[PDB]
Amino acid sequence: DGIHNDHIKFLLRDLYDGKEENVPVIEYFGGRILKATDEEPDIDGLTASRDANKISYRLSNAPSANLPDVDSFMQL
């Protein structure tokens, strides 16, 4: 603990001005996010739509074989 806190304190004083307010905050400390400058779904077989009520994701019903990841699909 001590060795972690001397680090946050070292780190605060060094890049935050002692200002605890200058420290970003998140919901839960997990993975990082890849911020999109686009934010537009350029994916095959997938169509994307949205109101302020509902975001619609529909995968193609084409017999043909093309679809996004199981990974990409769970990012979105």
Side-chain angles (χ1 to χ4, degrees), residues 26-33:
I26 345 171
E27 185 95 352
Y28 50 90
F29 186 53
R32 220 204 218 199
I33 296 181

Side-chain angles (χ1 to χ4, degrees), residues 54-68:
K54 149 214 160 182
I55 321 185
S56 156
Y57 284 112
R58 161 134 42 207
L59 292 184
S60 186
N61 202 356
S64 64
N66 240 197
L67 280 183

Side-chain angles (χ1 to χ4, degrees), residues 10-58:
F10 258 106
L11 223 49
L12 190 65
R13 143 207 160 246
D14 273 345
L15 251 169
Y16 290 98
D17 302 54
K19 287 254 156 280
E20 289 195 22
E21 334 155 329
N22 303 352
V23 166
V25 172
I26 345 171
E27 185 95 352
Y28 50 90
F29 186 53
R32 220 204 218 199
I33 296 181
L34 292 144
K35 286 185 187 185
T37 58
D38 300 335
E39 287 143 354
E40 297 140 349
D42 306 297
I43 325 160
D44 271 7
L46 153 139
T47 43
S49 165
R50 65 154 127 163
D51 325 328
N53 275 338
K54 149 214 160 182
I55 321 185
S56 156
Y57 284 112
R58 161 134 42 207

Side-chain angles (χ1 to χ4, degrees), residues 1-11 29:
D1 269 355
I3 296 192
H4 180 224
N5 292 2
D6 293 358
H7 278 261
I8 52 191
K9 296 200 317 178
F10 258 106
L11 223 49
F29 186 53

